[PDB]
Amino acid sequence: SDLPLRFPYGRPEFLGLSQDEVECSADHIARPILILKETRRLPWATGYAEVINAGKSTHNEDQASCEVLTVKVSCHYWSLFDGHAGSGAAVVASRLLQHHITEQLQDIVDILKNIPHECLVIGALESAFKEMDLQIERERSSYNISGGCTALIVICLLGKLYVANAGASRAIIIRNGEIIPMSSEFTPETERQRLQYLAFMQPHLLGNEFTHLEFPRRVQRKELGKKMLYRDFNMTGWAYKTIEDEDLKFPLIYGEGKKARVMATIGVTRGLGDHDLKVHDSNIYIKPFLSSAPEVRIYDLSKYDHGSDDVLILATDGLWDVLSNEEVAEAITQFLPNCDPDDPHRYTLAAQDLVMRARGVLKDRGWRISNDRLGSGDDISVYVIPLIHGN
Amino acid sequence: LPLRFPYGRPEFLGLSQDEVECSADHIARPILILKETRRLPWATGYAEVINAGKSTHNEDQASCEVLTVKKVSCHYWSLFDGHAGSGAAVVASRLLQHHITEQLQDIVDILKNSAVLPPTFFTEKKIPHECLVIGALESAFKEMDLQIERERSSYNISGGCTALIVICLLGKLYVANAGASRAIIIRNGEIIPMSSEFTPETERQRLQYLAFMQPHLLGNEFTHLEFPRRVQRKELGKKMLYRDFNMTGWAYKTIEDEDLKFPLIYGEGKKARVMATIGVTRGLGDHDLKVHDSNIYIKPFLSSAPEVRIYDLSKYDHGSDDVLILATDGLWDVLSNEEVAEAITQFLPNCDPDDPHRYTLAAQDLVMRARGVLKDRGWRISNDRLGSGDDISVYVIPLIHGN
Ligand SMILES: [Mg+2]
Ligand SMILES: [Mg+2]
Ligand SMILES: [Mg+2]
Ligand SMILES: [Mg+2]
C-alpha cells in the first residue's frame, strides 16, 4: 500500500474510454453497460460488453485485453481477468500476460513448420501463466499489485483455438445451437482432493488452526466421541469417524456450492497474485494452496465450416452465477438471427444482450432478472467471438 | 515366517492339488473353467490361464461369494493381480470381503430407508445413500491394506497386488478398482467403461507432485521431472523438452545437473515405470517394496484408494447378452474393449439363453482369444498378433439377474 501503482487503474484499453467516461461508468445504481464503440472494431469483429458490480467494490475489478500478437506468425489473443481483493493483479495481467505468451511461443515458433505440436503450444501457455505470476511475485516489492485474479485467455494459433483457464470464469462454444464447453471451473468444491492432500502432506500450512477433513456441517465440542460423517483426501464418499480433538478445528473446506471457501478466505483455487494473502486476521498464508497452472482445452477450427451465429462465449462468473449454459445458448440463438449477417456490430450487441439478461433491472428489493430471479451483483464481462473467421 | 494362507487357485474351481499342478504348465497353458457342477452366483462365468513362463505360479487370484450384512444380501466378485509373490493376492482374496462386510454393517440400517444422518445460514449437507456405500468400500481397501501392513510381521505375506472388486447392493453395482485391471459393461453391443487404470502414465502428476513436495522420497537418485527420452550428461547446458507436475504439455528447460538423475516416470505407455520398478500405482501390499538394489521404499508413491463407479441396475431391462466383464490386464494387454465387445456379441447368440454354462463358455472364449496357440513363432492370436503371456482371469457377469 506504500508503493506506486504499476499501471493506472482503467477499463480495457480497447473501449477507448476517456477518464470522464470511466468515472460515469462506475455507477452502482444505474450500472451503465459499457459496449465496444462501432468506431473501434476488435479483431474478428469480436463483441464485448461489461457492467460494474452493484456496490461490493468501488472499482470494476474485471479486466479484459484483446489484440493480435506477432511471434518472431499471427496469434490472436483474448483474455478475461476477474479481480478480487484489489484491481492491481488484474490490471497488470491484462497488460503483461500476452508478452509472456509471445515469448514462450517464440521458443517453439520455428518447430511449428511441419510429441505432437499441440502439446508444445499447451506447454508454452502453462509456462506463460507460471511466468506471469512470479513476475507479479517479484515486482510485488516495487509496485502495489493488490490482490489476485482469475485468468481466462484464448489464442487462435494456426487454425486452432487454445482456451487456458485458471479460475472460475467460463468459456463455451455455441455451434449450431449445441453447447461445447471449453473450460471447467477451479473452486474449493471441484478441487477438494488436491487441497486436502497437500494439507495432509505438509500439515504446517494448516497452522494448528484447521483440519484437512471435511464434515457435513461444523463439528462442536459437545460432540466428541460420536460417530460423525467425514471425508478425507483419498475418499469421494463418506464414512463414520469418532471425533478426536483435532477434528474440532475449522474445516479446510467449508460450504456447499458457490458459497464454499478454502480456510474461510477464498472461493477460487487457481489464478495469479495473492502472494501475501493471509487467513482472516491470522498469519497463515493462502498462496501455498493456490495454483497458477491453467487447464487447456483445444478446439480445431478446421473440422467444421462455421456459420454467422457460431460463436465462442467468454464471460466472468458474474454472468454464469445467474445464467446456465442453456439460457446463454437460448439468448444467443434467439438474438443473433435478428441482426444482419454483414453487420460488424452484430456480436457486440449479442454481448450486450447477454450482460443485460444477467444484470437485470433495478427494483425496490434489488436487481431482478426474468422469472423474479435475483440478478447478478458482480462485475460482468462478456466476449462473443464469431468462429466464422476461423474457416 | 509361515504363510497366512496356502497358495491355491480360486476356491470355486474346486481344484484338487494334483489338478492345480497340471494347471501350472507354461507350455500347454491349459485354460481352466468353472465346472458345470459348481454354479457361481447369477450363473457368472469364469476362466483363467497361467502365464507363459514369467513365474512358476499363477499370481492372479479371484473370489466370488454372496455376503450377508447384519447389525441384507451383498453379491461380491473380486480379481487380484499379484506381483513379486503370491502372498498379498491370496490374503486379499480371502479377507477383503470381510472388511467390506464390516464397514457395511455400520450403515446397513440407514441403507434400507430414506435420508442419511450425520451423527450415529447454519447450512448442513445431505449425503446420498450411494455416497455411504462408496465410503465403505474406500474404507475397506484402506483396512485390508494396513491389516497386511501389521500382520506382515507374523506371516509371509509376499509382494503386493492390484484389486478390482464389484458388489451388488440394493439394486446398484459398485465397481471399485485399485490397479490396472479393467471392468466394462457390454449392453446391447455398446461399451460402458466401469473402471480406469492406475498406472505411472495415468497418475503421473500425482506422483511428480508428491516427489516435489517430499524430495526425500527420491533419496538423491531420481528426479521428479519427465523427459521424452533418457537425459545424457553430454546435454548439460542444452535446451531440452521437460514436463513438470503442473503441466500437460512440454516446454524447454536448460539441463541442470539434477536433470541427470533417473526419471521418476520413464517408459512410453502401459510400459511406463515408477522409479524403474513397478508399472502400476495402486493396490495392496508392497509395504517393504524397495527400488532395484536400493533402500528407497516405493510404497510412499503407491495408494490403496480405489476409484468407485456406480451402475444403477434399475434404469433398463437387460437382455440375455448384457454383461459386465471383469478381467486382469492379461486380457486387455492384447485385446481392446471393441474386440471383447465384438467377441461377446458374436459368441453368446450361439448358446441357448437358458444355458447356465453359457457365460463360462464366453469367459473361456475370451481367454482363448487372448492366449492364442503356440507354434514356433510364439503364442499367437488372430491376425498373427502376439498373444498375451501374462496370467489371464475373466469374469462374465450377466446383468439380467439384476433386473
Ligand atoms: Mg470481481
Ligand atoms: Mg467475480
Ligand atoms: Mg502378475
Ligand atoms: Mg498381470
Residue numbers in the entry:
A (entry chain B): 33 to 104, 142 to 183, 235 to 511
B (entry chain A): 35 to 105, 142 to 190, 229 to 511
Provide the authors' original text about this structure.
The crystal structure of PPM1H reveals a structurally conserved phosphatase fold that strikingly has evolved a 110‐residue flap domain adjacent to the active site. Cellular assays, crosslinking and 3‐D modelling suggest that the flap domain encodes the docking motif for phosphorylated Rabs. Therefore, PPM1H has acquired a Rab‐specific interaction domain within a conserved phosphatase fold.
Full‐length PPM1H expressed in E. coli cells was unstable and prone to degradation, thus difficult to crystallize. To design a crystallisable protein, the N‐terminal residues 1‐32 were eliminated due to predicted flexibility. We also introduced a D288A mutation (PPM1HDA) that destabilizes a third metal ion (Mg2+/Mn2+) at the active site. Previous studies of PPM1A (D146A) showed that this variant acts as a substrate‐trapping mutant (Debnath et al, 2018). Crystals were grown of PPM1HDA that diffracted to 3.1 Å resolution, but no crystals grew of the WT enzyme. The variants PPM1HDA, PPM1HWT‐LD, and PPM1HDA‐LD have identical 3‐D structures with two Mg2+ ions at the active site. However, all of the structures are identical with only minor differences arising from flexible loops and the presence or absence of the third metal ion at the active site.
